């Protein structure tokens, strides 16, 4: 509850938070200069709910029987064998979100992601089916869209779009993107965010891992809902200061995350790489922006874009509609300019 | 068209029927004494359509989209894995009626038959689904009833009741049924036929192969519709003279077939066993009843029942409601009396 400034002791802290603080590698001086922030990040880290989101309501606003399931599945389920329509199956994930596969549609030659939900075992069947119903009308080229679904016993196969160019992470870790490429990627991600925000969705997880690239440079976001959670513990480097403050927050957390990602595209790794997670949260809460590797190397107009994304004041932080008009995006190359970086990244994996 | 009595030549016969008649092993004298019958059986044998029946209209009277299929399947499909709910799968048939399996329900311990229909490849999807919808309300203990269905991709699994005692054929070929056992089986088959007839269904295939026995002597018919076609070319020994005449026919063909089956239960084999099929049809058309092995061995009251089933006049042939009241059925033993015959038959198969 309270803090004594000269001793440096918090008064009346819960069992867990006293325990966490000792492991935090936050200094007594740091506790002194920002006592409120420390309590905020201790509370945040203690919460640690997986906090799964589901899109709801197909129209503009956005204990179950076999017959009610078959009612809901009327407009989503195709009569087809997913073992004949798709090949090159590879398992890429398993957990509470279903098992997940990549595969290739035999007829079109296009890669897809297939999520497999056990309707009998899975809790909140109604939410998942409701999300698919949303996803059928919630269509945009910069997201992974719902393609198809199949009922295989008690197992619902949800097929989403996918791309064969890898993640943006692979490109930034293995190559050096110039600013005109970074502008191109930022523009595509802002187009996606503008669409998501227009439809009352906050993504919440904008990071290069959730940015999927096609071979000709097409860009799509993933991990915004349940169904699009098709990519597979540590520091949440991408989170805005309001979130880790445990304040109420809005769509401009995605803008913060986009700024963090633009820094990742320059430095070739995420920030806070070797930090204690609690210290990292503390640093996000007090400092916001992690200090740059070598900031003279960037152009002023990119530094401007980075500032407008990484403003700590939510009112001063830019909207997606606003940043779409920012001069940095005018430096943007054709998306095909990414093709050599993607191929280089693919042949550099060597694993 | 015509016949010249002294030469013994039919005039103006089609290509096929002149061809068939030479292979028929019907005599010139036999052609003479019954010229009309010969033409009737030649026409009948030339027709040879598989002539699949489907029950239609669930209420008292009795180019398709994925969404229309999922509409129709609303009340029939369970959300479950048929590979986990049933074990001891054995494939017992394949063809135009789907692939067919026996299996055992894990939870209940009861044997079932599972028919597997490819919805994408199968013609007349609507008829099959309509039949299942009938089968859900068309319930009787002396038929195999619809239990459950599952959608597995484009494959619809239809689960029907089954029994582990084998067919009536196995019991008659390997054991000697006394008349009180035969009365018991006839009563059960007439109870089934009375129900089928009451619901405007003619079975059309009453033979011991389609009579399924349980271990404690329970009796059920199969092969009346599409779904109940769960048992797997030669002589149609069981057919009434009206059918092979190619006249119009009614439900009392099932009564003829029941009489033929009661003879099979005595002689231990079907009639016409080594005949030419065309001669067999000729003999059914002219003589009706095949001549008995040793008729003094049967009781007069059984011979009476056999006469009322195997009357060639449809008006004199008995109805199922009528034969249920016939004195022969009063000789009927408890169905458990079949249990030793079934076990004997099962251990006699040795294959």
From Swiss-Prot, chains A, B:
Membrane topology: Lipid-anchor
Locus of motif Nuclear localization signal: 82-88
Residues with PTM N6-acetyllysine: 43
Subcellular location: Nucleus; Cytoplasm, Perinuclear region; Membrane
Source species, domain of life: Eukaryota
Active site feature: 204 (proton acceptor)
Residues the record lists as binding ATP: 92-100, 115
Region (Autoregulatory region): 1-52
Outcome, altering residue 115 to R: Abolishes kinase activity and autophosphorylation
Modified residues (Phosphothreonine): 49, 58
Modified residue annotations for Phosphotyrosine: 54
Annotated segments matching region GTPase-binding: 1-27
Name the UniProt record assigns to this protein: PAK-2p34
